[PDB]
Structure formats: structure tokens, C-alpha cells
Amino acid sequence: ETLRVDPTNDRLSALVEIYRMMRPGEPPTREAAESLFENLFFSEDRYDLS
Amino acid sequence: AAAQVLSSVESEIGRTTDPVRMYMREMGTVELLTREGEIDIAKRIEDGINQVQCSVAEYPEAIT
């Protein structure tokens, strides 16, 4: 059901909508979106679960 | 085409009052030709100034 409500398709459009929820109104430069998501959960320095 | 990309991003702008974002967007469209492009417009400066000076030499009241 989840897949149906989500009109977005590829990795990139997902990263776009991700970025557009986090920074609504900032133009979706590709590398900016990728860097955002990556740094959100996979940044060593930002993210430590301990 | 640059303006078209501005407007699509503007259709999504979710009332983000942050003027940082706004300025960043506009500047983001305007590219920057370097090297000689800069000197191009510098030449336009020089010729504008001399233009008015030509008038000063030619014009009666100006020398007065």
C-alpha cells in the first residue's frame, strides 16, 4: 500500500522529496540531496549511537 | 532556461521564510564567466566615462 501512495520512483526522486521536506524551497541540486540523506544517518561525526 | 529552473523550485517553496534560501536560489541561477568576461564589462566602464568627457570638451557651458 505504501508503494502506491508514494508516486516517487528512483533513488534520486526519493532523495529529492527527502531534501524537499527537510529544506522546502531550496533547489534540489543532486549532490546536495545525496549529501543531506547520507550525512543524516550515515555521517560518523554527526551520528553516533554508541 | 535558467529562469525555468528557478520557477520550478519556486513552485515547491514551502513558505521557507529563511532569506538565506531565497538569495541562494537567485544567485544559483546566475552563472559566472571568468577571465575575459570580467574585463569585457570593465571596458564598458571606461568608454562610458570618456563619453561624457567628450561632451565636456565639445559643450559651451562645460568648459565655462
**What distance in Å separates residue B19's CA from the closest CA in chain A?**
11
Q: In the structure grid, which three cell numbers stand for residue A23, read together?
A: 529544506
**Resolution of this PDB entry, in A?**
5.5
Single out the residue of A40, A12, A33, A29 nearest to residue B25, CA to CA: A29
**What distance in Å separates residue B42's CA from the closest CA in chain A?**
32
Residue recorded with cell 534540489: A28
Nearest 5 degrees, angle CA B27-CA B28-CA B30? Answer: 65
Single out the residue of B28, B22, B21, B23 nearest to residue B5, CA to CA: B28
Name the experiment that determined this structure: X-ray
DSSP letter, residue A24 = T
- Judged by a CB distance cut-off of 8 A, whether residue B5 touches chain A is yes
